[PDB]
Amino acid sequence: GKGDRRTRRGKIWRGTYGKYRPRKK
């Protein structure tokens, strides 16, 4: 959920990046 920083959409919520939301194309 948007409050678990350890999920994809979690990190999208705070709009940060990381292991669970890496920046790539």
Partner RNA sequence: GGCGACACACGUGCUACAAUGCCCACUACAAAGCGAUGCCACCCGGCAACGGGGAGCUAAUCGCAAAAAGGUGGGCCCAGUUCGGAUUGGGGUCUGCAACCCGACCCCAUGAAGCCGGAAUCGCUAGUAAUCGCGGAUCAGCCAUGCCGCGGUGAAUACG
Partner RNA sequence: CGCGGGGUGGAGCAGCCCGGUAGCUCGUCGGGCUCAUAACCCGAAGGUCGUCGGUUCAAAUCCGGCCCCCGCAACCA
Partner RNA sequence: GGUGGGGUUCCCGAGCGGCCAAAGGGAGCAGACUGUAAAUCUGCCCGAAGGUUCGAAUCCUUCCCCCACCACCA
Partner RNA sequence: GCGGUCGCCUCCUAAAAGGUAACGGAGGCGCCCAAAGGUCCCCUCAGGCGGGACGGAAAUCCGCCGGAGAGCGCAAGGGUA
Positions touching Mg ion (CB under 5 A) are 4
Distance of CA 8 to the CA centre of its chain: 4
Residue nearest Mg ion by beta-carbon distance = 4
SS3 22: coil
What's the CA gap between 16 and 8, in Å, rounded?
A: 10
Q: Which does 9 bind (CB under 5 to 8 A by kind): Mg ion, RNA, none?
A: RNA
- Whose Cβ is closer to Mg ion: residue 4's or residue 5's? 4
Positions touching RNA (CB under 7 A) are 1-23, 25
Least distance (Å) from Mg ion to the CB of residue 7? 6
